[PDB]
């Protein structure tokens, strides 16, 4: 989940 929002970002 965490590494999903930084890439999205």
Same mark, same amino acid.
């Given at each position: !989940? *965490? *590494?999903? !929002? *930084?890439? *999205? !970002?």
């Amino acid at each position: !989940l *965490a *590494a999903s !929002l *930084a890439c *999205a !970002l």
